[PDB]
Chain A
């Protein structure tokens, strides 16, 4: 199997990745870095989320529609992993690529609230600085930004934490252990999927949103009421 997978990966790499990363994955000076030693996790995160191929150099590559199937992604990841290893994918106990099982360390059907309570503090210390409380995004220097954490699946959250994409820091499994990462996943998916009890969230941005809402349209409708009740002469 694995050699057929590496053949498929090499053939896809040769018509999609070879201009910026070189034929021996060494990198091309100002087009892309070396892929020697990135691992299957880096290729999975980058290709599956749609970030690769980059097609113009800017401040930041953006998440877009994926160019390769998940099977094709894993073929390319096999081929790249043969050029010096690196961190790999998180598989579950049966052997399938792990997904909803990563929703907290004590997952069993549903998210447990202790995991959310510890992952909230972990996220608020290690992540929210860039991604805002509950992961709505943030702006960095010179056109860079921390994305919105909605589109990412659990495997992508884990591999983002491992691989440190673009200006994101790395969080090895010695820094944040497996359980702490799984609790961060639990927190992201709890907040990403629980409607606010107090009605419409207004994007959960914070005070600027409610400001704009009131200080434009809220005062506008009461000005309209005043014009209904009062005289224009």
Chain B
């Protein structure tokens, strides 16, 4: 995954440049349609955005440096090079809808700010995420 990891440095350099430019400009430049002073929202936003693209670019690069030459990253790969297992995928699950319902109960409790609704929604949410994450591991019944 070379090109994917490497193309995250375009926007990283650009957003860092725009961050420093915006910062110096908003603190030093004066025009009649704004008040001079560093604008903190855009400052923090742009530097953290460059942080996000830095994060992905660096992690994906640090992975790329020790993955083998895969057939999907090769220009003349034969279709039989990926023959074998591809991986495990969930065939079905009721718990995504369950989680959406838990989050719905939580959000309506937050709306009305009923304390019992917030408590029950948080309980439902931890339960449904737990049951999602225990789906393919529940024991066989021992009776």
Q: How many A-B residue pairs have CB under 8 A?
A: 7
B119 to chain A, nearest CB (A): 11
Q: CA separation between A203 and B143, bound complex, in Å?
A: 44
Distance between B28 CB and nearest chain A CB, rounded to angstroms: 37
A116 to B141, CA, bound (A): 60
Within 8 A of B (CB), among A210-233: 217, 231-233
Number of residues from B at the complex interface, CB < 8 A: 4
Q: Could you tell me how many residues of chain A have their Cβ less than 8 Å away from some Cβ of chain B? A: 5
Q: How far is the CA of A203 from the CA of B120 in the complex (A)?
A: 15
* Chain B residues, CB < 8 A from A233: 141, 143
Interfacial chain A residues near B143, Cβ < 8 Å: 231, 233
Among the listed A203, A217, A232, which residue makes an inter-chain contact with B141, where contact means beta carbons less than 8 Å apart? A232
Could you tell me which residues of chain B, from 102 to 141, have a CB within 8 Å of some CB in chain A? 116, 120, 141
- With both beta carbons as reference points, the residue of chain B lying nearest to A233 in the complex is identified as B141
In the assembled complex, the CB of B135 is this many whole angstroms from the nearest CB of chain A, namely 15
CA–CA, A137 to B48, complex, Å?
Answer: 47
Which A residue sits closest to B143, measured CB to CB? A231
In the complex, residue of chain A having the shortest beta-carbon distance to the beta carbon of B115: A203
- Bound-state Cα–Cα, A28 to B116, Å: 43
User: Which A119-160 residues have a C-beta within 8 angstroms of B?
Assistant: none
Bound-complex Cα distance A54 to B56 (A): 50
B2-54 at interface with A (beta carbon < 8 Å): none
Q: Chain A's nearest CB lies how many Å from the CB of B122?
A: 14
Specify the chain B residue showing the minimal Cβ separation from A203.
B116
Convert B44-72 into 0s and 1s, putting 1 for each residue whose CB lies closer than 8 angstroms to a CB of A.
00000000000000000000000000000
* Chain A residues in 8 Å Cβ range of B141: 231-233
Q: How far apart sit A85 and B132, CA to CA, in the bound complex (Å)?
A: 67
A62 CB, min distance to chain B CBs, angstroms: 13
Please indicate the chain A residues that have their CB under 8 angstroms from the CB of B120 in the complex.
217
User: Which residues of the partner chain B approach A203 to less than 8 Å between Cβ atoms?
Assistant: 116
- Complex CA distance for A214 and B15, rounded to whole angstroms: 56
Q: A53 CA to B141 CA in the complex, in Å?
A: 64
A231 contacts across to B, CB distance below 8 A: 141, 143
Can you sample 7 A-B contacts with CB below 8 Å?
A203-B116, A217-B120, A231-B141, A231-B143, A232-B141, A233-B141, A233-B143
Pairs A-B, 3 closest by C-beta atoms: A231-B143, A233-B141, A232-B141
